[PDB]
């Protein structure tokens, strides 16, 4: 995979600090704070 | 109800933000690539030369 | 470390399924590392992490 070269020469990719579940919790906020 | 039928079949509408992820892929390509590059040197493999 | 029919790398090698066509030799990968190689003596498509 491309991720899997990239990982084998020295390039990593860090985890973003805020999964997906997480931004889908604040844009349900904001989202249900607004309504 | 119509912007889910928009979404449904455009993938133009997020150009902007599938362009920011090829530009990277793209950059991060071309940065490995570099690494079979002779750059004036007998070999790209380290250590064959 | 390892050598195949004088390919030299390092990795980890496993089992794959990824399937050749007899006379070839390597797998690639879209980076023109060498992802896949295939045992001389018992033919298998061993994976290199």
């Given at each position: 995979?491309?991720?899997?070269?990239?990982?084998?020469?020295?390039?990593?990719?860090?985890p973003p600090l805020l999964t997906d579940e997480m931004i889908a919790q604040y844009t349900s906020?904001?989202?249900?704070?607004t309504i | 109800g119509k912007i889910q039928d928009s979404l449904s079949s455009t993938?133009?509408?997020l150009g902007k933000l599938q362009d920011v992820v090829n530009q990277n892929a793209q950059a991060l390509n071309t940065l490995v690539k570099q690494l079979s590059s002779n750059f004036?040197?007998?070999s790209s493999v380290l250590n064959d030369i | 470390?390892?050598?195949?029919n004088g390919l030299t790398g390092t990795?980890?090698?496993?089992?794959?399924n990824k399937k050749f066509?007899?006379?070839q030799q390597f797998g690639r990968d879209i980076a023109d590392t060498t992802d896949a190689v295939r045992d001389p003596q018992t033919l298998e498509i061993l994976d290199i992490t």
């Open positions: 995979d491309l991720i899997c070269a990239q990982k084998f020469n020295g390039l990593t990719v860090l906020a904001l989202l249900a704070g | 993938a133009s509408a004036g040197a007998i | 470390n390892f050598n195949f990795g980890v090698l496993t089992e794959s066509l007899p006379f």
